[PDB]
């Protein structure tokens, strides 16, 4: 069986309805490199669970799942990751002499 996952460049993987959700995120890693724990996969309005299998989610051939990268916690008032990185870089600024 085959299916598609969408950077916007839809990819194609070969799987059977018996393979688990953890294995799907593994096959993504062989093509996109993203670690599986950062991968979040949506199928028709919900985020699938790394346990329940493909047949356990009624996934059919030619279907599509959206891939959304998990993000570091963005608590209220936190710095964005770029702001945090720029702040730490400025710890090393110097005015010599």
């Amino acid at each position: 069986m085959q299916i598609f996952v969408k950077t916007g460049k839809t990819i194609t993987l070969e799987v059977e309805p018996s393979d688990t959700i953890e294995n799907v995120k593994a096959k993504i890693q062989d093509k996109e490199g993203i670690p599986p724990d950062q991968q979040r996969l949506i199928f028709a309005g919900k985020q699938l669970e790394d346990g329940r299998t493909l047949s356990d989610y009624n996934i059919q051939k030619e279907s599509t799942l959206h891939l959304v990268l998990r993000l570091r916690a963005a608590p209220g008032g936190s710095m964005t990751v770029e702001e945090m990185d720029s702040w730490i870089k400025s710890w090393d600024q110097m005015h010599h002499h």
């Binding site: 991968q39 990268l69 936190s78 945090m84 870089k89 710890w91 090393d92 110097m94 002499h97």
Partner: protein, 305 residues
């Protein structure tokens, strides 16, 4: 140990000047990044000048125990640097050399010394006896053991700590001393104690936190700059989840983390209102902090919770 008169401060100034002149050698090609000995020594001179002007009695300032210990170490450390150049000769200009490695080590020590002096003399006035230790449990220990003292000999500190957090051997005590004795003078100041207990909080598991982060964790890199963190992780730029964590000589008591993202970028961050080991546990579970220094195996710090 001995009292500090003006003549002794002037001797130290002259020794610092000679270190500065030695480190101005173009053949050294000193990196323009912290710790920068060519700024740290003039800044140390300047803060000492500031202290002296607050005490225009100099009898009082010269008898202060912390200041006596600090000035003795300053004289010892600058003389050590001067001997390093004379012994090292042309090897000082080879980066892989033991002389050059030692100069790097001494440059950090001068950085720690200035941070400590500014911590104890924040506006040039002695304030060690009112120094506020950051972590409550750590402060209660220091007050019960040492009261209002600003500095204690290592043997006194070790014995007091062992009553609360047993130190199992002479070997473990020497490793601990190497981490906490930042200014390498065989004393523990309240400032050094504050830094250590901030880094290795919570107090309830202090030595276990220290062992698990600074001794047995391949992600630990000790002191690095931001630029150096990027350089270290560059090897693993295409291995998302590779990470290291490190100390900043410009921000003592602060942990910082660097990691490789899924899209080939290196980002740097700090633990958010939580001990470093909890950030490491969380980052592993969330897929960000997987491969310490690129290694496939990651220490599991869960037992510290």
């Amino acid at each position: 140990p001995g009292t500090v008169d003006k003549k002794m401060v002037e001797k130290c100034w002259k020794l610092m000047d000679k270190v500065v002149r030695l480190c101005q050698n173009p053949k050294l090609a000193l990196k323009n990044s912290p710790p920068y000995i060519l700024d740290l020594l003039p800044d140390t001179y300047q803060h000492l000048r500031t202290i002296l002007s607050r005490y225009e009695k100099m009898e009082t300032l010269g008898e202060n125990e912390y200041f006596r210990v600090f000035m003795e170490n300053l004289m010892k450390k600058t003389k050590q640097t001067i001997s390093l150049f004379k012994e090292g000769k042309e090897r000082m200009y080879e980066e892989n050399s033991q002389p050059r490695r030692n100069l790097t080590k001494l440059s950090l020590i001068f950085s720690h010394m200035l941070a400590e002096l500014k911590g104890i003399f924040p506006s040039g006035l002695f304030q060690g006896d009112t120094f506020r230790i950051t972590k409550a449990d750590a402060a209660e220990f220091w007050r019960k053991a040492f009261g209002e003292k600003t500095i204690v000999p290592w043997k006194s500190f070790r014995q007091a700590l062992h009553e609360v957090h047993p130190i199992s051997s002479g070997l473990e005590a020497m490793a601990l001393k190497s981490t906490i004795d930042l200014t390498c003078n065989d004393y523990i100041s309240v400032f050094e104690f504050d830094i250590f207990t901030r880094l290795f909080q919570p107090w309830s598991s202090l030595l276990r936190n220290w062992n698990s982060l600074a001794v047995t964790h391949p992600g630990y890199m000790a002191f690095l700059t931001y630029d150096e963190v990027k350089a270290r992780l560059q090897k693993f730029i295409h291995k998302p989840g590779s990470y290291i964590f490190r100390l900043s000589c410009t921000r003592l008591g602060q942990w910082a983390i660097g990691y490789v993202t899924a899209d080939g970028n290196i980002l740097q961050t700090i633990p958010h209102n939580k001990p470093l080991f909890q950030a490491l546990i969380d980052g592993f579970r969330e897929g960000f902090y997987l491969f310490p220094d690129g290694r496939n195996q990651n220490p599991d710090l869960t037992g510290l919770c």
